[PDB]
Motif scaffolding. Structure first.
Motif, PDB file in Angstrom:
ATOM      1  N   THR B  32     -22.311 -29.191  93.500  1.00 36.54           N
ATOM      2  CA  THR B  32     -21.856 -28.953  92.143  1.00 36.54           C
ATOM      3  C   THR B  32     -21.564 -30.311  91.516  1.00 36.54           C
ATOM      4  OG1 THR B  32     -20.951 -26.744  92.576  1.00 36.54           O
ATOM      5  CG2 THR B  32     -19.999 -27.973  90.741  1.00 36.54           C
ATOM      6  N   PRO B  33     -22.039 -30.575  90.297  1.00 37.32           N
ATOM      7  CA  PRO B  33     -21.661 -31.821  89.619  1.00 37.32           C
ATOM      8  C   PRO B  33     -20.165 -31.862  89.350  1.00 37.32           C
ATOM      9  CG  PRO B  33     -22.808 -30.339  88.119  1.00 37.32           C
ATOM     10  CD  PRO B  33     -22.972 -29.769  89.493  1.00 37.32           C
ATOM     11  N   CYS B  34     -19.587 -33.054  89.468  1.00 41.77           N
ATOM     12  CA  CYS B  34     -18.149 -33.206  89.321  1.00 41.77           C
ATOM     13  C   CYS B  34     -17.755 -33.159  87.843  1.00 41.77           C
ATOM     14  CB  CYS B  34     -17.672 -34.489  90.003  1.00 41.77           C
ATOM     15  SG  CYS B  34     -18.573 -35.995  89.576  1.00 41.77           S
ATOM     16  N   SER B  35     -16.474 -33.409  87.580  1.00 37.63           N
ATOM     17  CA  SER B  35     -15.900 -33.150  86.266  1.00 37.63           C
ATOM     18  C   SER B  35     -16.448 -34.104  85.210  1.00 37.63           C
ATOM     19  CB  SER B  35     -14.377 -33.263  86.327  1.00 37.63           C
ATOM     20  OG  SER B  35     -13.785 -32.823  85.118  1.00 37.63           O
ATOM     21  N   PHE B  36     -16.685 -33.566  84.017  1.00 41.37           N
ATOM     22  CA  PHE B  36     -17.149 -34.352  82.884  1.00 41.37           C
ATOM     23  C   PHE B  36     -16.801 -33.597  81.609  1.00 41.37           C
ATOM     24  CE2 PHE B  36     -20.963 -32.595  80.769  1.00 41.37           C
ATOM     25  CZ  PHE B  36     -21.103 -31.438  81.511  1.00 41.37           C
ATOM     26  N   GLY B  37     -16.856 -34.311  80.493  1.00 46.54           N
ATOM     27  CA  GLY B  37     -16.562 -33.705  79.209  1.00 46.54           C
ATOM     28  C   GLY B  37     -16.667 -34.736  78.109  1.00 46.54           C
ATOM     29  N   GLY B  38     -16.399 -34.280  76.889  1.00 48.26           N
ATOM     30  CA  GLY B  38     -16.475 -35.141  75.727  1.00 48.26           C
ATOM     31  C   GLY B  38     -15.179 -35.885  75.460  1.00 48.26           C
ATOM     32  N   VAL B  39     -15.305 -37.019  74.778  1.00 49.55           N
ATOM     33  CA  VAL B  39     -14.167 -37.851  74.403  1.00 49.55           C
ATOM     34  C   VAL B  39     -14.024 -37.809  72.889  1.00 49.55           C
ATOM     35  CG1 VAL B  39     -13.101 -40.115  74.575  1.00 49.55           C
ATOM     36  CG2 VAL B  39     -14.611 -39.312  76.395  1.00 49.55           C
ATOM     37  N   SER B  40     -12.852 -37.392  72.418  1.00 47.18           N
ATOM     38  CA  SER B  40     -12.551 -37.329  70.996  1.00 47.18           C
ATOM     39  C   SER B  40     -11.285 -38.126  70.721  1.00 47.18           C
ATOM     40  CB  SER B  40     -12.380 -35.882  70.524  1.00 47.18           C
ATOM     41  OG  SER B  40     -11.336 -35.238  71.232  1.00 47.18           O
ATOM     42  N   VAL B  41     -11.250 -38.791  69.570  1.00 46.79           N
ATOM     43  CA  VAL B  41     -10.176 -39.710  69.217  1.00 46.79           C
ATOM     44  C   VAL B  41      -9.431 -39.161  68.008  1.00 46.79           C
ATOM     45  CG1 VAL B  41      -9.691 -41.968  68.204  1.00 46.79           C
ATOM     46  CG2 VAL B  41     -11.142 -41.792  70.233  1.00 46.79           C
ATOM     47  N   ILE B  42      -8.119 -38.999  68.151  1.00 41.38           N
ATOM     48  CA  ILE B  42      -7.243 -38.658  67.037  1.00 41.38           C
ATOM     49  C   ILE B  42      -6.759 -39.953  66.403  1.00 41.38           C
ATOM     50  CG2 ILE B  42      -4.841 -37.964  66.602  1.00 41.38           C
ATOM     51  CD1 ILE B  42      -6.859 -35.835  66.130  1.00 41.38           C
ATOM     52  N   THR B  43      -6.948 -40.075  65.094  1.00 43.40           N
ATOM     53  CA  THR B  43      -6.447 -41.213  64.344  1.00 43.40           C
ATOM     54  C   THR B  43      -5.894 -40.732  63.012  1.00 43.40           C
ATOM     55  OG1 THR B  43      -7.107 -43.196  63.104  1.00 43.40           O
ATOM     56  CG2 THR B  43      -8.846 -41.613  63.674  1.00 43.40           C
ATOM     57  N   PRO B  44      -4.788 -41.315  62.552  1.00 44.93           N
ATOM     58  CA  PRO B  44      -4.283 -41.020  61.204  1.00 44.93           C
ATOM     59  C   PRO B  44      -4.917 -41.851  60.099  1.00 44.93           C
ATOM     60  CG  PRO B  44      -2.767 -42.473  62.320  1.00 44.93           C
ATOM     61  CD  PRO B  44      -3.873 -42.191  63.306  1.00 44.93           C
ATOM     62  N   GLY B  45      -6.030 -42.509  60.371  1.00 47.04           N
ATOM     63  CA  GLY B  45      -6.640 -43.437  59.445  1.00 47.04           C
ATOM     64  C   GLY B  45      -6.354 -44.875  59.830  1.00 47.04           C
ATOM     65  N   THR B  46      -7.271 -45.769  59.452  1.00 46.80           N
ATOM     66  CA  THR B  46      -7.091 -47.186  59.745  1.00 46.80           C
ATOM     67  C   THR B  46      -6.031 -47.829  58.861  1.00 46.80           C
ATOM     68  OG1 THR B  46      -8.233 -49.315  59.902  1.00 46.80           O
ATOM     69  CG2 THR B  46      -8.940 -47.801  58.163  1.00 46.80           C
ATOM     70  N   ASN B  47      -5.629 -47.158  57.782  1.00 49.58           N
ATOM     71  CA  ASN B  47      -4.650 -47.727  56.862  1.00 49.58           C
ATOM     72  C   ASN B  47      -3.225 -47.543  57.371  1.00 49.58           C
ATOM     73  OD1 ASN B  47      -3.744 -49.022  54.561  1.00 49.58           O
ATOM     74  ND2 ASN B  47      -3.823 -47.168  53.288  1.00 49.58           N
ATOM     75  N   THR B  48      -2.927 -46.383  57.959  1.00 51.63           N
ATOM     76  CA  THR B  48      -1.547 -46.064  58.311  1.00 51.63           C
ATOM     77  C   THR B  48      -1.088 -46.827  59.550  1.00 51.63           C
ATOM     78  OG1 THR B  48      -1.930 -43.858  57.391  1.00 51.63           O
ATOM     79  CG2 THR B  48       0.069 -44.191  58.688  1.00 51.63           C
ATOM     80  N   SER B  49      -1.730 -46.581  60.690  1.00 48.51           N
ATOM     81  CA  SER B  49      -1.332 -47.223  61.934  1.00 48.51           C
ATOM     82  C   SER B  49      -2.520 -47.263  62.882  1.00 48.51           C
ATOM     83  CB  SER B  49      -0.148 -46.502  62.591  1.00 48.51           C
ATOM     84  OG  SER B  49       0.299 -47.205  63.737  1.00 48.51           O
TER      85      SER B  49
ATOM     86  N   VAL D  11     -16.485 -38.550  86.427  1.00 44.75           N
ATOM     87  CA  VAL D  11     -15.892 -39.061  87.658  1.00 44.75           C
ATOM     88  C   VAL D  11     -16.926 -39.925  88.367  1.00 44.75           C
ATOM     89  CG1 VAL D  11     -14.354 -38.428  89.534  1.00 44.75           C
ATOM     90  CG2 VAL D  11     -14.873 -36.771  87.743  1.00 44.75           C
ATOM     91  N   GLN D  12     -16.620 -41.208  88.517  1.00 48.64           N
ATOM     92  CA  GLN D  12     -17.503 -42.089  89.261  1.00 48.64           C
ATOM     93  C   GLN D  12     -17.434 -41.753  90.749  1.00 48.64           C
ATOM     94  OE1 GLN D  12     -19.620 -44.304  87.927  1.00 48.64           O
ATOM     95  NE2 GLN D  12     -18.937 -43.821  85.845  1.00 48.64           N
ATOM     96  N   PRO D  13     -18.563 -41.782  91.456  1.00 50.45           N
ATOM     97  CA  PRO D  13     -18.541 -41.476  92.892  1.00 50.45           C
ATOM     98  C   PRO D  13     -17.802 -42.545  93.681  1.00 50.45           C
ATOM     99  CG  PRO D  13     -20.705 -42.255  92.225  1.00 50.45           C
ATOM    100  CD  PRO D  13     -19.925 -42.049  90.965  1.00 50.45           C
ATOM    101  N   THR D  14     -17.038 -42.096  94.677  1.00 52.09           N
ATOM    102  CA  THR D  14     -16.228 -43.020  95.464  1.00 52.09           C
ATOM    103  C   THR D  14     -17.083 -43.828  96.432  1.00 52.09           C
ATOM    104  OG1 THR D  14     -15.745 -41.218  97.002  1.00 52.09           O
ATOM    105  CG2 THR D  14     -14.156 -41.632  95.241  1.00 52.09           C
TER     106      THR D  14
END
Ligand SMILES: *[C@@H]1O[C@H](CO)[C@@H](O[C@@H]2O[C@H](CO)[C@@H](O)[C@H](O)[C@H]2NC(C)=O)[C@H](O)[C@H]1NC(C)=O
Ligand SMILES: *[C@@H]1O[C@H](CO)[C@@H](O)[C@H](O)[C@H]1NC(C)=O
Ligand SMILES: *[C@@H]1O[C@H](CO)[C@@H](O)[C@H](O)[C@H]1NC(C)=O
Ligand SMILES: *[C@@H]1O[C@H](CO)[C@@H](O)[C@H](O)[C@H]1NC(C)=O
Lengths: 122, 49, 50, 50, 49
Positions: B32-49, D11-14
């Motif tokens: 079984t392939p190991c864990s993976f997923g998407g990366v999403s970034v929360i930002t309040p805008g480049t002006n605020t902080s 996960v990178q393989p060990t």
């Protein structure tokens, strides 16, 4: 493998009747066809058999002339025709399945039909 | 997943290996392939902080 | 050494129906709960078998 | 301000593990590469390596 | 059963692969033969199937 025959009929003496027999679920040309009768109140009487390939009948004693055997291939339905019917012909006729082994037949009757009840009376 | 003695590793509807035979201990192991997923970034805008 | 067999009845063979037989595993791949199509030599369904 | 999908993590393989069958004997390549005589093209020899 | 091919479905597992490279056009089967005291005669006729 089903062996359905024609329904019952009533007929005055001196006429001629025909009884059909439809076979299904198995290759008709592989097995021969055998006929048997049963008068009400006694056992089984065998008049003979007909080959399903060449169509030649082979009657037993006392059934020559009056009884006619005939087959066909496309519809694949056996027929039994009796002429000059009298009172002693009142019986039920059963079709008997017999596999073709050669000029000498065995005694294995594996499948039978429901029978066709005929009655000759005035 | 029991394996018939003639057959090697199996496959799924995605043409990827899912079960395999060990060449030494002759046992069946799932892949079984190991864990993976998407990366999403929360930002309040480049002006605020 | 060779000997011909005598007293045997030479008869033509017969036919019967093969009810969905002759199906074998096409490959060495384990599959589960999937309808898989294939193109290979097979016995056709309800064929005449000698 | 808002949501933005940037990239993906994994996960990178060990380490790495190699599985090979228990076998030690060597194939006789010199039997067929240094043979005394070779068969003709119309009668080509077939030899099993296993 | 008694005297007919049965009705049903079956999946045939592979048995063995035989790399032979030969040309096959015809085939024949091998049958056994029973000889006893009920089958007198020579080797050509003293037998039962
Ligand atoms: C069994 O009978 C056959 C004939 O039905 C013999 O066949 C021989 O066949 C070869 C070629 O196929 C011919 O050249 C021979 O002339 C045939 N023999 C004869 C006697 O005519 C076969 O030999 C017989 N088996 C044995 C052991 O004699
Ligand atoms: C940040 O936003 C305010 C209004 O919300 C605006 O007046 C200001 O100019 C912005 N900052 C920059 C660097 O533009
Ligand atoms: C099998 O043979 C019979 C007679 O030889 C024929 O009526 C039938 O159509 C054949 N069936 C197939 C599937 O070839
Ligand atoms: C095998 O033998 C037959 C017999 O004549 C021949 O027709 C055929 O070309 C040969 N080769 C193959 C590959 O079938």
């Amino acid at each position: 493998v089903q062996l359905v025959q024609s329904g019952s009929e009533l007929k005055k003496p001196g006429a001629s009747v025909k009884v059909s027999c439809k076979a299904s679920g198995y290759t008709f040309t592989s097995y021969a066809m055998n006929w048997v009768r049963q008068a009400p109140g006694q056992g089984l009487e065998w008049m003979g058999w007909i080959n399903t390939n060449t169509g030649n009948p082979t009657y037993a004693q006392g059934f020559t002339g009056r009884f006619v055997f005939s087959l066909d291939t496309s519809v694949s339905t056996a027929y039994l025709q009796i002429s000059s019917l009298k009172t002693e012909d009142t019986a039920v006729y059963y079709c008997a399945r017999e596999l073709w082994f050669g000029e000498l037949l065995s005694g294995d009757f594996d499948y039978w039909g429901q029978g066709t009840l005929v009655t000759v009376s005035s | 997943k029991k394996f018939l003695p003639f057959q090697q590793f199996g496959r799924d509807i995605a043409d990827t290996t899912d079960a395999v035979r060990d060449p030494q201990t002759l046992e069946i192991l799932d892949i079984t392939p190991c864990s993976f997923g998407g990366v999403s970034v929360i930002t309040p805008g480049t002006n605020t902080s | 050494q060779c000997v011909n067999l005598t007293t045997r009845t030479q008869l033509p063979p017969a036919y019967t129906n093969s009810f969905t037989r002759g199906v074998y595993y096409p490959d060495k791949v384990f599959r589960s709960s999937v309808l898989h199509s294939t193109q290979d030599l097979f016995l056709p369904f309800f064929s005449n078998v000698t | 301000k808002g949501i933005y999908q940037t990239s993906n993590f994994r996960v990178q393989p060990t380490e790495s593990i190699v599985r090979f069958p228990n076998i030690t004997n060597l194939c006789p390549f010199g039997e067929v590469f240094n043979a005394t005589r070779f068969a003709s093209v119309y009668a080509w020899n077939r030899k099993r390596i296993s | 059963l008694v005297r007919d091919l049965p009705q049903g479905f079956s999946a045939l597992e592979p048995l063995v692969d035989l790399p032979i490279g030969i040309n096959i056009t015809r085939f024949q089967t091998l049958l056994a033969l029973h000889r006893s005291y009920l089958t007198p005669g020579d080797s050509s006729s003293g037998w039962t199937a």
